[PDB]
Design a protein around this ligand. Sequence first.
Ligand SMILES: Nc1nc2c(ncn2[C@@H]2O[C@H](COP(=O)(O)OP(=O)(O)OP(=O)(O)O)[C@@H](O)[C@H]2O)c(=O)[nH]1
Ligand SMILES: Nc1ncnc2c1ncn2[C@@H]1O[C@H](COP(=O)(O)OP(=O)(O)CP(=O)(O)O)[C@@H](O)[C@H]1O
Ligand SMILES: Nc1nc2c(ncn2[C@@H]2O[C@H](COP(=O)(O)OP(=O)(O)O)[C@@H](O)[C@H]2O)c(=O)[nH]1
Ligand SMILES: NC(=O)c1ccnc(NC2CC=CC2)c1
Ligand SMILES: [Ca+2]
Ligand SMILES: [Ca+2]
Ligand SMILES: [Ca+2]
Ligand SMILES: [Mg+2]
Ligand SMILES: [Mg+2]
Ligand SMILES: [Mg+2]
Lengths: 438, 425, 352, 54
Amino acid sequence: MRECISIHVGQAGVQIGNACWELYCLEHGIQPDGQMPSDKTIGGGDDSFNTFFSETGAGKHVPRAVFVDLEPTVIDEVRTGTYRQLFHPEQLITGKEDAANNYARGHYTIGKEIIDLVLDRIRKLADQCTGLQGFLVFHSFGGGTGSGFTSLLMERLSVDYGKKSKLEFSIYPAPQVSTAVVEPYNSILTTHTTLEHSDCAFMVDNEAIYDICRRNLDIERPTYTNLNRLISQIVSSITASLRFDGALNVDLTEFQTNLVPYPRIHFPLATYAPVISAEKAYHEQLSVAEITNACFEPANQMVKCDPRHGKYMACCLLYRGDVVPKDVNAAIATIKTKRSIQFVDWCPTGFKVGINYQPPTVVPGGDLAKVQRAVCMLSNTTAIAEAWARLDHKFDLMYAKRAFVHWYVGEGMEEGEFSEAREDMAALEKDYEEVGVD
Amino acid sequence: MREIVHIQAGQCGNQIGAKFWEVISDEHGIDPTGSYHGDSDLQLERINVYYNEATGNKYVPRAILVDLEPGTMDSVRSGPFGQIFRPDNFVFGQSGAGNNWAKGHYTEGAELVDSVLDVVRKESESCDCLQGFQLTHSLGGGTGSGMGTLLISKIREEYPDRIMNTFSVMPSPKVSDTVVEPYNATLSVHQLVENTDETYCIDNEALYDICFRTLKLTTPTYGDLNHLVSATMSGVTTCLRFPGQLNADLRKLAVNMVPFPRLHFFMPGFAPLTSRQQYRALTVPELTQQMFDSKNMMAACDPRHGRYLTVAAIFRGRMSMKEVDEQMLNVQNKNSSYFVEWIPNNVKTAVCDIPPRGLKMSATFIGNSTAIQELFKRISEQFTAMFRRKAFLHWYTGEGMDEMEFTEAESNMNDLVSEYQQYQD
Amino acid sequence: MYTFVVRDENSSVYAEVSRLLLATGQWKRLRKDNPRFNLMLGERNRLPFGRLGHEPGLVQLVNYYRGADKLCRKASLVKLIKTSPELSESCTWFPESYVIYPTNLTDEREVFLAAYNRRREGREGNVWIAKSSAGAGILISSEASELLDFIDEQGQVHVIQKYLEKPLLLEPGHRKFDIRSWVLVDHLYNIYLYREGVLRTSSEPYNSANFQDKTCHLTNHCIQKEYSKNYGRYEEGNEMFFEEFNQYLMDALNTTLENSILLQIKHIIRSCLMCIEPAISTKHLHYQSFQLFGFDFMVDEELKVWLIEVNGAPACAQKLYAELCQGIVDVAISSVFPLAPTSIFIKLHHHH
Amino acid sequence: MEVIELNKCTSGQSFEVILKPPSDPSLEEIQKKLEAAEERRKYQEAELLKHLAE
Ligand SMILES: Nc1nc2c(ncn2[C@@H]2O[C@H](COP(=O)(O)OP(=O)(O)OP(=O)(O)O)[C@@H](O)[C@H]2O)c(=O)[nH]1
Ligand SMILES: Nc1ncnc2c1ncn2[C@@H]1O[C@H](COP(=O)(O)OP(=O)(O)CP(=O)(O)O)[C@@H](O)[C@H]1O
Ligand SMILES: Nc1nc2c(ncn2[C@@H]2O[C@H](COP(=O)(O)OP(=O)(O)O)[C@@H](O)[C@H]2O)c(=O)[nH]1
Ligand SMILES: NC(=O)c1ccnc(NC2CC=CC2)c1
Ligand SMILES: [Ca+2]
Ligand SMILES: [Ca+2]
Ligand SMILES: [Ca+2]
Ligand SMILES: [Mg+2]
Ligand SMILES: [Mg+2]
Ligand SMILES: [Mg+2]
């Protein structure tokens, strides 16, 4: 057994982490006080769920997580919420004033004065791990803390934990659920200094989660609560292999090995289905073929893009519920003969499939309905580069006029670090075109 | 705990700040003696932002009353909510400023500035975490303009990384005390350009035309004009004073609104603006259409004469947020020729479930528009009209100023006009 | 008030569509860089499809199907037909074609020579044509050495396809011609065929014993008006429309344009478009697509219709700009952004 | 169409299917970038005070 440390940075990171550990508990049958009846080994054990939870002599199963925010408002909810008893005060780090959606403020100004503290709190979790695998870092692209402080934490983690893997869960900025305007700057800044330090990054576009909540769950104007309970389902399905018995994606290394043939292109697209409104009378349960065929509609992609006009480099199918291999192969065959699935000539045209029998767990009173089977497809397509193009274009519209640059310079950043980051992105967009276009 | 320090200076500064503390005090359920009597917890959520918590659950506004003559501040103390302010926070002289910027900034005001800062410092030291300052004042007089800017110049020196937002009343010849107001105004503008982060520009003429033309008041008064500023000041602070999916402090608010350091002058607006047909329910379309109407704005500037850099809108009341998004997206997509196309998503919206006193729903408008150059152009025209003959300068040279400093203030704002011009094309 | 932007200043088709949209008083034009638009008249090459459909509340519509280049590129169409089971390599309406890359750069050079040597041995008509998308540059020859030596002297992808040695010749004149059919596809993937086509004819008598002079072999409207000496003799602008052409078919061969030609064309347009539907459809996409197509056909002396190429950014005949452009607005633009007949199109129903 | 590496346990199973075969900054440097930005803040704040001093 090998442990995995989760880190949550910024507002988005902390709330999404809250929605995830709430879900993990409902899946592993762990109650709000940390007790687990089905766990028969008290105070210890090397089970699969122990990769995310440690155990105390009293029987409490405590997450291996560290929440970090430069202002205490969002983390205070965690300190007084339903699952307050899980964590201890060490795991919750709060500053006094945030980074004002300013990358320079979260990286240089405020970050410099709290980094050594965060590391010490992470070292305290690492010392408990007999064989630490790596870290899972949740944050946002637009937030001054999620962007500015994450890139610094990553640079230092690559120094104190060299051989450890680092996976990202990044929130792509979407105007519908944002009141800020400088988010393109932060996103392109944080991706520039983090690229070499992240082994695999899953980007969720709020715009996508938004329309999935309005279209499938009939939410007219969704809250962050709605957006997070859904994003926690995807994350739960992407990490279930690490927490449950299995053989596919059993440690963080197998993510890069399975999904990232080229290092810089470590951004897999995620697709999930079904997503059914609980308020619904009663839905016709979709079969394996139907839910699998849905994994190729742009409607249930975490980032809106067109894979048909890109090339795949890898492809994982994670199933949860009543699913058997026979039905998986049948669906797969029928889809190749109807879809546009162009693989890169230097990669095998195939699919790695995992099946966990336990069906998706749903939050009581949440928006999602209980289904008998569900799937999550991770696919590395050059089509996700559309995302960067959108973002890189906005960056160009503002930077051409040097708008808002003073706020960043004023925190100690140099104006050259913009163009340097921007030219890095242009190189990333170029690597995506070299790999998928003819 | 993100506390704000309020400063009001001079006759206009205090009468506006006065009513302001009167309007938000009612919204937060604080009576004229400092006792809470509301029915909702949302009133106390962000209450420590503008109020200090004293003994016995008493809430004392965190405001500093400043003036060079005792008249106005006596009025506030005997006013309706006068007993709520801290007796120590009254810092006033006796000579007066004589509607002279020089006296407020160099001679008279200078003799009282240290003592005013001693109170500012006393309030800040108790702030668990200070967000920043806000000043109410006029620019055409002597105290709020002369000493007001003097205070800002000294607050940026002692608090260099704190936000300084101001509500500044600009002088118009139509609502004029003295002929030297363009002098006092031009001088204060350079200080705000240099040391303030956000300056809400309020033109008395616009306030007048709104009371006379729209509200249908045959003979308006500074009191009528201050009602509009009270309701507006309440609006642009609803974000800070009440909860919601916003969650932002002064520095974060300015980051998403000021793309260039010296161009931090906004045009506020309010809606509805109805004359006494006042009980008619107002729809979300009507609310939005007026909010963008120039006649609903208080800078006496036509927005269609310039372009918008950024726009913030705060909606108050129990309405359909789905219907708010639809309507806001409608105004943008119906007049996208007056927004700059090089700042994506430069129009944001926030909702607040608590409406102002006596309104089902309302909107508050914050426009960072290049059209504001028309304001500084009028002021510069009226300034040169007199400085070219050296008219009325003796009031200032007699207080120690030189013609050179005036010539500089002249060029300082002409630059401010050239800056606003290169971005309108 | 709908809004649109114009990114292609050279498009004569959508230059009138824009003029019509503005004449409606309900469509406002924006600068070519403003993203807050409803309709986009995009550029030909490198159109930024990735940036469409991300403006809250705005429903966006573009005039190019992403991936249609697979059908409008010389080397792309050939590869599409041979590899697509729906069309198969045994397609009977598409000239036996081969994709040839210059030797200075897969490639069907050897496969071409095999079918070339089989014909030369069987005394069959062995005259081929070489062409590419990078042309205004075409070479017709019956010797395999010239064709291959001509492509090596270039540097882009070429295609060698059989030259129709027995084309249908009009009278009087004894001249060649091609057919242009405009097919509009809306967002719902309905295939509307323009009731009005055109025939770009040659004003020179056909001569099969001299492929060196290419004025009587090529029917491009620019070649006839430059290198041909009988331009405008028989018809105006070397263009005969479906009324005069239908009357000639009934007088000479005792048949109609509907039964003799239009049926096949309607079949080709359907098979070509149904083939790539699952690849370019914007049915569940965050934006919507539509596109006008300019199919070019050939007619032999046995009244069999062959496919030459498909134009993704085609032009229209001077006499039909008004009727066609108006229809574009009725079924392609107003069908998504309604305003406040006898359709000029022929709907080709199919299974989606 | 081939199924390889079929693994089974009590909570599920996983396998692979093939349709077609193919054809850092050290700790020293980080402190420098950080302190360099702090130095540019101290100098930019100094110029403000020097301006106010004047
Ligand atoms: N999906 C999702 N997105 C969020 C959530 N919270 C914030 N965001 C997104 O994050 C972006 C802004 O970043 P924040 O996380 O709020 O900023 P921060 O990390 O707290 O950093 P500061 O600027 O210092 O406050 C916006 O675009 C939001 O849409 C959340 O709970 N769920
Ligand atoms: N296999 C073939 N048999 C007979 N004629 C052919 C032919 N291929 C091409 N042509 C002639 O060439 C002309 C079309 O050339 P092609 O379409 O390849 O070039 P192009 O694309 O620049 C013209 P356009 O785009 O306007 O249709 C037709 O007029 C036709 O007469
Ligand atoms: N809106 C408004 N404007 C005022 C008020 N009092 C003064 N003014 C304006 O401010 C200018 C005079 O400045 P004043 O307030 O007397 O400066 P002081 O010396 O600090 O008191 C004139 O242009 C007036 O129009 C007021 O109560 N409301
Ligand atoms: N001083 C400001 O710039 C300011 C103050 C209060 N609200 C603002 N805008 C709202 C738009 C949506 C959320 C915040 C801006
Ligand atoms: Ca155990
Ligand atoms: Ca590393
Ligand atoms: Ca004195
Ligand atoms: Mg925050
Ligand atoms: Mg006065
Ligand atoms: Mg062509």
